[PDB]
Design a protein around this ligand. Structure first.
Ligand SMILES: [Mg+2]
Lengths: 419, 474
DNA sequence: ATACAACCTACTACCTCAT
DNA sequence: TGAGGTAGTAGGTTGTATAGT
C-alpha cells in the first residue's frame, strides 16, 4: 500500500519553504517523506529514498525552484518518480511546487515543464489550498489532522540541533568582591578644624561632610598638609562604629540608621577608587556620572596586557578599553565594573565630541563578543591589581580597602552547544 | 562560587492548543489562538499613503525573508500565517491631501502644528468610524515623512517655511493621535510611509536612507501581529499559567506642565494570561517624589485602582483572583501597600514585585562568543533574585540583547511568595507582547509599555476613559 | 545674609519604535 | 536593523529655609 507525500527539494535554498510545506502538510494529516526530518547515516540513504518513492509514495512533490531543477540530488530524486510515473499510471503523481517567482522555462526540467502549476508564488496559503484542493479531486489518503504530530517534529527535529542542553558552564561577574574593610569606621567631631566651605576631594583621602562630624576610614591623624590646627582633637571624642556590624544591620542608631551608613561607604569606595586611579597608570575618561579609566597608547607592550589587547585601532581612531567603578554593598559588598570604550584619534589625546564617540562605541562594540568583553575586563582588573589576589584602595595610610581582582564565578548546570 | 538555577522557557499556546516558544514559529506552524474573519483595513493617509499601504498588503501576502531566518524566522505570508486575508482590494480610505498637510503643518509652533494635524486625522478617522455603515477592523495611520519629521518637540522647522508667526510663544503626534481617539474606542495602527516603502525613499547617494533588506520579513511579523491583534483576536496565550493570577503593571508619567512638579498621571495595566491587557486609567495626583526620585500613591486613589482592577476582573472571570502580583520599577511604601491590602479579598494573595533594570551582575560566560542563555537566574534571597530575560537563545541561535546581557533585579518588595514562581511568571510575561512579535521581550509586558503608555495618559487628561484593552492604548 | 537642603542636567549604556 | 529615545544616576547648579540685622 502507498500513502506518503514524498517531498523532493534543494537544500538549503528551499529549506524555508519545504520545512513549511512538510510541516503544514504533516499537521494537516498527510504522511510526508522529506530529507528534512531524518538524520540518515546509511548507504541505503539513497535506497531509502528510492524504496520510499518506489513503493509507498502516493505523491511526489518536487520544489520547482531554479536550484531545484538544476540540483543533481533533486534531479536524481526526480529520476524515480517518472520511472514510477508509469507504474502508477496516474497523471498527477508528480507535482512541481512552483515557489520561485523567477523560473525561466529553460531552467525547468522537461518532464515537469509539462505538468500543471501549483502556485506557491502569489501566496503560500492559496497554494496550500491549491495543493490540498488538488488532494481532494484525486483521493490521496489522509488521517484526521493532528497538528500535534506537526510540531512534535518541529520541536524534536528542527530544534534538535540547538536547544538548552543539560550542560555545565561558569560565568564570571563584573562584580569584584571587596575582601577587607577597616576594622572600624570612625566619625570626627572635627568642629573648628573642619571648614565647611573647603572641598576635601583634593584631600587625597575619601572625606565627606555628614552633619557636624567628619566621615572617613582615614584616622583623624591622616589629614595634615591640607588641614592645619587639628592636633587639637581628642582621639577619644569620635564615634568609632564597628564596621563588621554595619553590613549586618547590627548598627541602627536612631540618630542615623544603617541605610544611611551603607550609602556612606560607597562615595568613599568610589572615591578611594577615583584617587587610586590618580596614581595607577591610566588616563581617565570623564563622563558626568563618574570617571572611566582607559590605559593610554603604548603603556603596555604592543598595547597588550597579559596577552589581551586592551588598546587597539578602529578606522583612524584608536580604541582603548576603559572601566568604571560602581561600588555596591548588597547582597555582598563588591566593586562593580562596567566596561567602556573610550576613543582617541591619536595615542593619548582624547576625542572631543561624544557624538563621534557614541557612533565609534557602537561601531567597535559590534566586533566584541562575550568571550572578548570578558577577557579585556578581567585583564583590565588583573591589570590594575597591586598584588596577586586584589587591588589596594587607599582610604588612608594604615587603612586600606582590598578588592578581589577576579569576579564572583557563577556555576550553572544548563547551557547551549556553541554554533 | 554561587550557583544559577535555570528557568524553563515558558510556553505560549497557539491554534489547536499547540504551544511552542517562538510566536513567529507558533503562528507560522499553526496560526493564531483565535482565527478571525478577515481584517477590514481603513487608511488615513495621502493618496500616496494608499499605494504604499497597498504595496505592503500585496507585499506580505507572499513570503518575505529575513537576512538569516534562524535568528529571525521568515514570514510565510499573511494568509499562510494567520489563516485569514488582510486584503488590499478591500480598503476603506479617508483621504488626506498635501493641501491639508501643507495648510495645517506649516504653523510656527510645533504644538499648534501638531495638535491640529492630529485633530485632522481623528476627524478623518472618527467621521469614517462613527458615520460609516461599513465597518473597518483597524485604522492605519500612514504617516508621510513630512509629518514624522516635524511633529515632535525639539524638531525645528526652519524660519523660512512658516506661513503664520506663532499666535503666542504632549507634542508627540502619534501618541497624541492614540490619546485623542482614546475616548471613542478605535484601533489605531500607525505606520510610516518610509517604512512600508523603504526602497522607494532613496537618499542623495541613491541608496535608500534606511535600508531594511536584512529584516524585511521581521517587519511583516511585527506589523501583522500587531495588525492581527488590533483587528480583534489575540495571536497566542500563555501555555501553562496557573488559574486565577492577576498581573498589575504600575505606570506613572510626570506631568511637567504643572507648576507643582509632582502632577504625574497614573495607571495600572492588568495582564492575566493573554496580554491583551486591560489599562485601568488612574487620575492625576501627586505621585512623583522630589526627595526619593520615585513614584507613589495615596491610599484613596490606590484603593480605587486595585478595586477597579479586581472588580473588572470579577466581572470578566466571575471570581476574585487567588493571586495578584503588582509590578512596578520602584519599591512600595508601606502605606500605599496597606492601601492595596484593605481593598483585597481575605484569601487572595497580593504580591508586589519591583523589576529594576539597575546595572548589576552582568554575567560573562567563561568560554565562547555567546553569552549566557536566557532563563538562567541568580537567586540572592528567598525574596530578591536576578533574572535573565536577555541573552543567548538556542532556538534563535542569537543573543536577544545584542551585547552582553543585563539581567533584571526582581524583588518581592511587598507581600510574600515563592521567588522561583516570581521569576517563572515574569519570564512568562515577556512572551505576551503582541505588538513587537519576537521570541521574548527584555521586560514583562506589565511594565513593558509604561513609557509609551506614560505619554498617552498625560497626552489626554480631560477624559475619564473606561478601563480599556491594549489595542486602544498601543 | 548664607548653611543647606532637594532638584535638573548631561552622558552613557541599553532598548525600542511612526515596527 | 538602527537611528533613535529612555532610564537610570550621580552630582554641580539652584531654589528654600534658617539665622541674624
Ligand atoms: Mg513594535
Amino acid at each position: 500500500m502507498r500513502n506518503k507525500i514524498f517531498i523532493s527539494h534543494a537544500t538549503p535554498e528551499d529549506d524555508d519553504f519545504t520545512r513549511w510545506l512538510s510541516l503544514k502538510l504533516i499537521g494537516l494529516g498527510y504522511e510526508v517523506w522529506c530529507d528534512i526530518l531524518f538524520l540518515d547515516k546509511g548507504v541505503d540513504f539513497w535506497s531509502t529514498i528510492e524504496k520510499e518513492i518506489r513503493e509507498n509514495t502516493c505523491k511526489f512533490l518536487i520544489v520547482s525552484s531554479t536550484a531545484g531543477n538544476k540540483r543533481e540530488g533533486v534531479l536524481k530524486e526526480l529520476a524515480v518518480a517518472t520511472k514510477v510515473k508509469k507504474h502508477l499510471q496516474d497523471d498527477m503523481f508528480i507535482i512541481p511546487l512552483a515557489i520561485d517567482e523567477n523560473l525561466s522555462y529553460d531552467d525547468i526540467n522537461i518532464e515537469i515543464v509539462r505538468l500543471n502549476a501549483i502556485d506557491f508564488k502569489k501566496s503560500w496559503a492559496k497554494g496550500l489550498q491549491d495543493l490540498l484542493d488538488a488532494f481532494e479531486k484525486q483521493n490521496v489518503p489522509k488521517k484526521p489532522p493532528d497538528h500535534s504530530k506537526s510540531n512534535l517534529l518541529y520541536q524534536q527535529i528542527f530544534l534538535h540541533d540547538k536547544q538548552a542542553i543539560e550542560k555545565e558552564e561558569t560565568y564570571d561577574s563584573n562584580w569584584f568582591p571587596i575582601i577587607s574593610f577597616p576594622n572600624e569606621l570612625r566619625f570626627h567631631r572635627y568642629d573648628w578644624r573642619l571648614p565647611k566651605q573647603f572641598d576635601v576631594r583634593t584631600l587625597a583621602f575619601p572625606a565627606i561632610r555628614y552633619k557636624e562630624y567628619l566621615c572617613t576610614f582615614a584616622w583623624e591623624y591622616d589629614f595634615i598638609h591640607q588641614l592645619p590646627k587639628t592636633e587639637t582633637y581628642n582621639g577619644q571624642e569620635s564615634i568609632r562604629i564597628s564596621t563588621s556590624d554595619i553590613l549586618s544591620g547590627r548598627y541602627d542608631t536612631d540618630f542615623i540608621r544603617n541605610y544611611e551608613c551603607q550609602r556612606l561607604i560607597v562615595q568613599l569606595i568610589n572615591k578611594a577608587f577615583e584617587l587610586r586611579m590618580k596614581d595607577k597608570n591610566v588616563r581617565e575618561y570623564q563622563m558626568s556620572k563618574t570617571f572611566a579609566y582607559w590605559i593610554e597608547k603604548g603603556k603596555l607592550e604592543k598595547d597588550k596586557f597579559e596577552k589581551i589587547k586592551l588598546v587597539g585601532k578602529q578606522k583612524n581612531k584608536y580604541w582603548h578599553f576603559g572601566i568604571s567603578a560602581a561600588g555596591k554593598l548588597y547582597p555582598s559588598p563588591v566593586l562593580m565594573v562596567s566596561s567602556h570604550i573610550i576613543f582617541t584619534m591619536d595615542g593619548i589625546n582624547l576625542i572631543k565630541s561624544k557624538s563621534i564617540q557614541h557612533s565609534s562605541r557602537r561601531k567597535q562594540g559590534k566586533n566584541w563578543w562575550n568571550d572578548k568583553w570578558r577577557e579585556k575586563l578581567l585583564a583590565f582588573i588583573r591589570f590594575l591589581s597591586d598584588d596577586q589576589n586584589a587591588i589596594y584602595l587607599n582610604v588612608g595610610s594604615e587603612e586600606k580597602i582590598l578588592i578581589s581582582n577576579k569576579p564572583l564565578k557563577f556555576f550553572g548546570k544548563m547551557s547551549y552547544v556553541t554554533p | 562560587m554561587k550557583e544559577l538555577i535555570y528557568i524553563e522557557e515558558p510556553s505560549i499556546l497557539f491554534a489547536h492548543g499547540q504551544k511552542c516558544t517562538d510566536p513567529r514559529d507558533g503562528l507560522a506552524l499553526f496560526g493564531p489562538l483565535n482565527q478571525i474573519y478577515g481584517i477590514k483595513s481603513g487608511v488615513v493617509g495621502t493618496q500616496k499613503g494608499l499605494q504604499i499601504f497597498k504595496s505592503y498588503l500585496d507585499k506580505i501576502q507572499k513570503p518575505i525573508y529575513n537576512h538569516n531566518n534562524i535568528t529571525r524566522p521568515m514570514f510565510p505570508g499573511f494568509e499562510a500565517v494567520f489563516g485569514c486575508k488582510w486584503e488590499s482590494q478591500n480598503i476603506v480610505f479617508k483621504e488626506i491631501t498635501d493641501e491639508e498637510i501643507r495648510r495645517y503643518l506649516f504653523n510656527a509652533s510645533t504644538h499648534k502644528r501638531t495638535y491640529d494635524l492630529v485633530t485632522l486625522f481623528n476627524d478623518k478617522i472618527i467621521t469614517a468610524n462613527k458615520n460609516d455603515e461599513e465597518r473597518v477592523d483597524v485604522w492605519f495611520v500612514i504617516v508621510p515623512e513630512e509629518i514624522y519629521k516635524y511633529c515632535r518637540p525639539n524638531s525645528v522647522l526652519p524660519n523660512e517655511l512658516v506661513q503664520t508667526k506663532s499666535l503666542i510663544s504632549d507634542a508627540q503626534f502619534h501618541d497624541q493621535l492614540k490619546a485623542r481617539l482614546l475616548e471613542h474606542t478605535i484601533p489605531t495602527q500607525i505606520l510610516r510611509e518610509s517604512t512600508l516603502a523603504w526602497r522607494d525613499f532613496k537618499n542623495t547617494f541613491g541608496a535608500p536612507i534606511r535600508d531594511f533588506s536584512k529584516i524585511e520579513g521581521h517587519l511583516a511579523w511585527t506589523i501583522s501581529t500587531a495588525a492581527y491583534y488590533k483587528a480583534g483576536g489575540k495571536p497566542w496565550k500563555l501555555g501553562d499559567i496557573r488559574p486565577g493570577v492577576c498581573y498589575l503593571g504600575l505606570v506613572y508619567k510626570k506631568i511637567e506642565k504643572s507648576k507643582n512638579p509632582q502632577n504625574a498621571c497614573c495607571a495600572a495595566q492588568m495582564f492575566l494570561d493573554n496580554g491583551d491587557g486591560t489599562v485601568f486609567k488612574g487620575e492625576v495626583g501627586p505621585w512623583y517624589n522630589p526627595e526619593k526620585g520615585e513614584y507613589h500613591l495615596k491610599p484613596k486613589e490606590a484603593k480605587a485602582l486595585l478595586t477597579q482592577a479586581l472588580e473588572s476582573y470579577k466581572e470578566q472571570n466571575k471570581s476574585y483572583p487567588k493571586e495578584v502580583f503588582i509590578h512596578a520599577r520602584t519599591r512600595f511604601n508601606d502605606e500605599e501597600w496597606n492601601a492595596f491590602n484593605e481593598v483585597t479579598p481575605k484569601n487572595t494573595n497580593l504580591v508586589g514585585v519591583t523589576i529594576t533594570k539597575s546595572k548589576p551582575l552582568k554575567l560573562y560566560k567563561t568560554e565562547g562568543a555567546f553569552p549566557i542563555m536566557r532563563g538562567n537566574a541568580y537567586i540572592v534571597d528567598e525574596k530578591k533574585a536576578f533574572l535573565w530575560t536577555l541573552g543567548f537563545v538556542p532556538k534563535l541561535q542569537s543573543t536577544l540583547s545584542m551585547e552582553v546581557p543585563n539581567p533584571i533585579f526582581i524583588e518581592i518588595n511587598k507581600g510574600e511568595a515563592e521567588i522561583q514562581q516570581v521569576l517563572k511568571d515574569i519570564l512568562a510575561l515577556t512572551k505576551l507582547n503582541y505588538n513587537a512579535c519576537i521570541y521574548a521581550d527584555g521586560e514583562p509586558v506589565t511594565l513593558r509599555f509604561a513609557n509609551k503608555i506614560g505619554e498617552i495618559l498625560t497626552a489626554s487628561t480631560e477624559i475619564k476613559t473606561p478601563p480599556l484593552a491594549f489595542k486602544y492604548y498601543i
